[PDB]
Symmetry: C3
Subunit: 534 residues, 3 copies
């Protein structure tokens, strides 16, 4: 009849994409390098009615982004402080005055005067010292040990991730959503909730809880090559302590170069440990097993201790008040299921190698006084052996972060599109995504404004500007350089779409339309450019 | 040659040294567009 | 003034930090620096002879 191509700019549609995200967060904490901005005191969440979106926590690039940022913050924070390479000397270690795990070692060091040396004493944990005038520090034959900067705590600070201009973060609100599949309730957010970068190896601590039941998430529940993340709907408290009244001694190595050594120990020598209530642990396991039997046939399920590898994988590690604990969890993962207080002994180490980076050890200075902390077990990391057997495990930090980022997806806004009409030449951002085209076309300014809204941030800003300009140049070429709705003189081809005006405008959404004519865009755009030159 | 103006116009937009080059390319693009806006025909390649 | 008693003396900062010598080819003669505005900004100057501040 009389239908013509009309160009719309600011159309609420999107496609999956990867990009650079920025932080939002709020002395000298290791995670507070101020490399990124403060938070929004009142961020908004927009419910998209009638939007179904496919989520996949195992293909979520936000995980890789977080992992990289965490490593960077850690490394930046450890740069401005003392190296312990001057301590790589032979130690003379004994046990003359400690017990009736800790060695009393003497050694020579430098002083601020290069021609002088003195003999000093320090206590070391056995795990940090290797025998060869008897002993050497564990990493002196492989790398340089850097001590933690003494004023920097490791206590996690929630970090929110926020979208750059041209992008949006979608959140899944389905209560029973597991790792993958369609989500029927999707909301758009400016930023993620704050995520605490808690580091742990077998149990997950201080994370989010499930809302109705225990949710078992896995990439492939039937494989043995994949880990299983179990999220609890109820926390279990774990009480950890370091009972020895350790003192701190400060040793001068050089010109403003200070080393912190364990001094003597006041009082009894006691072993570090963690306390878990027996009854809550058993209830937790009845429920973990109950939901595991929904993926597995009605088979006997057993749990065993981690099968092997080094201390980092076989034990549950965590940072409690600045000390690095390794705890024996064989007291938890030891049971058989068919159709009081638990005490976990622990060990303390000062020289650690985080994130499996071999050759980059750090020395944690001893902390003065007794240490106590209470944490929330909010989940578990389990693996399967080739009756089904489950063991705690997985030292790959990306799995901890997948437990918080599973609800989020990053998409790119694609504001330009076309539809036929009869002309011739407040919902919030993406709020109209579920509306029909005839309604959604009235909110175009909302999305158009959000196209403009370190090196990685400069690249993101420059690129967003370039994308904006490429779209404006294109519209200028076609005509209507100043308009969001532009009628042109290319007639509509019923072969692209034979839908009536009512079906297109009062029934279909823009997302559906985008799919419907997705393969004709390279024809229509050319026709517009060509008719313009006549 | 006046009939291929879109081909060249599109090629105006197409480490620190690369950021400087890209930022500058944008700035010179905008200066030409501002000038055309001042003269008139802000949206056209051929302006009488 | 640069030497402090402790084989009698030490340089004054050896127990606190590293002393870097001035690069020997670098002079310290002041060079006038002008401060200039970026696009979108302007610098205004006051010309009142008795203006104090
Ligand atoms: C899961 O989430 C849990 C809840 O958030 C976490 O548990 C919490 O963990 C934090 C961090 O370890 C604990 O916070 C510490 O608590 C210590 C206890 O102090 C007590 O007594 C104080 C007396 O004045 C009082 O003010 C405190 O309120 C408390 O009653 C604190 O000492 C410690 O302070 C640290 O930070 C201070 C910041 O200014 C700093 O000044 C302190 O300096 C002291 O220690 C240094 C050590 O060298 C000395 O040099 C100084 O001279 C000085 O003595 C110190 O650095 C901090 O507040 C928190 O209590 C704990 N909660 C519970 C319930 O125990 C879990 O840890 C999380 N889980 C995981 C795995 O992270
Ligand atoms: C390492 O320290 C031990 C500390 O016991 C030294 O062993 C002896 O310590 C007693 C302490 O009264 C001395 O009287 C002895 O003379 C020490 N033995 C010797 C052979 O001298 C031990 O010798 C030290 N080792 C080094 C390399 O210094
Ligand atoms: C640095 O020294 C350590 C300690 O001797 C070496 O670690 C040992 O390596 C052997 C290799 O088979 C293992 O069997 C031992 O169990 C390791 N010991 C410990 C305490 O882990 C390390 O390999 C040396 N590094 C280099 C580059 O030689
Ligand atoms: C769909 O998800 C939205 C959140 O995106 C839910 O809306 C929240 O509902 C709770 C109910 O107490 C309110 O307290 C929140 O303030 C609401 N948030 C927003 C952004 O409106 C909504 O209830 C969910 N609907 C279904 C069927 O699950
Ligand atoms: C551990 O879990 C407990 C219980 O879930 C948390 O304590 C309560 O959390 C709710 C959350 O809405 C608060 O409203 C209550 O006021 C909290 N209780 C108290 C006594 O304040 C506890 O905060 C969790 N701990 C951690 C570290 O997350
Ligand atoms: C998470 O929930 C999704 C949705 O039910 C599960 O995906 C289904 O898995 C079955 C397995 O045979 C397939 O036949 C369905 O076609 C899948 N649905 C979709 C939409 O793809 C997924 O397997 C669950 N994963 C876990 C660990 O529970
Ligand atoms: C999930 O894990 C199962 C079990 O390992 C995979 O099923 C196997 O797939 C291989 C591929 O050729 C077959 O040779 C095996 O015979 C299959 N085993 C069974 C029991 O069917 C399944 O393909 C995995 N799914 C995904 C998406 O990785
Ligand atoms: C971990 O420590 C907390 C307190 O920090 C313990 O909670 C107390 O437990 C006693 C037991 O009789 C109660 O009377 C107190 O009222 C509890 N206090 C609070 C604040 O709830 C907790 O029981 C300890 N956990 C373990 C496993 O011992
Ligand atoms: C955790 O503690 C348990 C014991 O409470 C350790 O298990 C013992 O390991 C020794 C090693 O020689 C065996 O001889 C014992 O027979 C084991 N005991 C049992 C009951 O099997 C376990 O190895 C410790 N695990 C870690 C990671 O330290
Ligand atoms: C899991 O629990 C069982 C039962 O408590 C432990 O069985 C013990 O095994 C040792 C092995 O030397 C025997 O001496 C004990 O007599 C057994 N206990 C009982 C009550 O008979 C089993 O060792 C535990 N597993 C781990 C790894 O600790
Ligand atoms: C560890 O022991 C020290 C000393 O026993 C305690 O700290 C104080 O040390 C001074 C040193 O002159 C004494 O005069 C104070 O009386 C000590 N305080 C107390 C309360 O006795 C230190 O508090 C102990 N740490 C812990 C956690 O008990
Ligand atoms: C999501 O879909 C529902 C219906 O499937 C939309 O509800 C209709 O909204 C129009 C608006 O004028 C009303 O006239 C209809 O009567 C409503 N239908 C029903 C059954 O109530 C809803 O508006 C859509 N959401 C969005 C954002 O457009
Ligand atoms: C520091 O230099 C002085 C220089 O005077 C040394 O003192 C004596 O200097 C005279 C000069 O003729 C010598 O003949 C003496 O032999 C020097 N004394 C000694 C004991 O040799 C002074 O000794 C020097 N100090 C050091 C540490 O070398
Ligand atoms: C480094 O050595 C200098 C010189 O001994 C120290 O400076 C003295 O500090 C005391 C502290 O009360 C003052 O009373 C003296 O007057 C200072 N002397 C001079 C020459 O200024 C300095 O404090 C030492 N630094 C450290 C870290 O110990
Ligand atoms: C420290 O140096 C002194 C210098 O005589 C030496 O006798 C002593 O044995 C050295 N100590 C150690 C533990 O090597
Ligand atoms: C320390 O050296 C002595 C010297 O003989 C030796 O007897 C002892 O076994 C050594 N200890 C270690 C841990 O090497
Ligand atoms: C956790 O899920 C189980 C599943 O039945 C439920 O019975 C229990 O009440 C839930 N816990 C909470 C705190 O809601
Ligand atoms: C946990 O449940 C099992 C079920 O057989 C039972 O044997 C065990 O004694 C229970 N443990 C506690 C702490 O109640
Ligand atoms: C539709 O496409 C065909 C392809 O041959 C073309 O001949 C026809 O003129 C087109 N109609 C419109 C309205 O563009
Ligand atoms: C230098 O050493 C000598 C040796 O006795 C001493 O008498 C003199 O007072 C010292 N001077 C200083 C500045 O220490």
């Amino acid at each position: 009849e009389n239908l013509w191509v009309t160009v719309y700019y600011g159309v609420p549609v999107w496609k999956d994409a990867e990009t650079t995200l920025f932080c939002a967060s709020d002395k000298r904490n290791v995670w507070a390098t101020h490399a990124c901005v403060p938070t929004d005191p009142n961020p908004q969440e927009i419910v998209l009615e009638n939007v179904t979106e496919n989520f996949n926590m195992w293909k979520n690039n936000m995980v890789e982004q977080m992992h990289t940022d965490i490593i960077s913050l850690w490394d930046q924070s450890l740069k401005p402080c003392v190296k312990l390479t001057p301590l790589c000397v032979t130690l003379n270690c004994t046990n003359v005055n400690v017990t009736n795990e800790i060695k009393n070692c003497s050694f020579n060091i430098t002083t601020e005067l290069r021609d002088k040396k003195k003999k000093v004493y320090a206590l070391f944990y056995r795990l940090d010292v290797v025998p060869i005038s008897n002993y050497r520090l564990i990493n002196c034959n492989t790398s340089a040990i850097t001590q933690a900067c003494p004023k920097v705590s490791f206590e996690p600070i929630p970090i929110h991730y926020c979208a750059p201009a041209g992008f949006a973060i979608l959140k899944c609100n389905d209560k029973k959503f597991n790792g993958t599949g369609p989500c029927k309730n999707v909301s758009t957010v400016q930023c993620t909730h704050g995520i605490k970068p808690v580091v742990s190896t077998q149990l997950l601590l201080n994370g989010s809880l499930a809302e109705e039941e225990i949710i078992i998430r896995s990439e492939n529940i039937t494989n043995n090559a994949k880990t299983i993340i179990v999220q609890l709907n109820e926390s279990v408290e774990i009480n950890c302590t370091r009972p020895n009244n350790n003192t701190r001694k400060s040793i001068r190595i050089g010109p403003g170069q200070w080393f912190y050594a364990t001094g003597d120990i006041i009082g009894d020598i006691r072993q570090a440990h963690c306390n878990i209530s027996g009854t809550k642990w058993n209830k937790t396991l009845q429920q973990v097993v109950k939901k595991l039997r929904e993926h597995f046939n009605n088979k006997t399920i057993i749990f065993n201790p981690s099968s092997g590898g080094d201390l980092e994988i076989t034990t549950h590690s965590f940072n409690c008040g600045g000390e690095f604990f390794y705890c024996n969890t064989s007291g938890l993962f030891n049971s058989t299921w068919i159709g009081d207080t638990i005490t976990l002994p622990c060990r303390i180490k000062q020289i650690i190698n985080m994130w499996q980076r071999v050759g980059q050890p750090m020395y944690a200075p001893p902390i003065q006084g007794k240490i106590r902390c209470v944490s929330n077990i909010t989940g578990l990391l389990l693996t399967r052996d080739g009756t089904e057997t489950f063991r705690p495990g997985g030292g790959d930090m990306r799995d901890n972060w997948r437990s918080e980022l599973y609800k989020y997806k990053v998409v790119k806004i694609e504001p330009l599109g076309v539809a036929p009409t009869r002309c011739k030449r407040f919902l919030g951002f993406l709020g109209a995504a579920g509306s029909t085209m005839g309604a959604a076309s009235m909110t175009l300014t909302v999305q158009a404004r959000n196209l403009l809204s370190g090196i990685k941030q400069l690249q993101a800003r420059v690129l967003a500007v370039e994308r904006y300009l490429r779209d404006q140049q294109l519209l200028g070429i076609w005509g209507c350089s100043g308009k969001l709705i532009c009628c042109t003189n290319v007639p509509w081809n019923s072969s692209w779409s034979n839908k009536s005006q009512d079906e297109i405008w009062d029934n279909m959404t823009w997302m559906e339309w985008d799919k419907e004519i997705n393969n004709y865009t390279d024809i229509i755009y050319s026709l517009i450019e060509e008719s313009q030159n006549q």
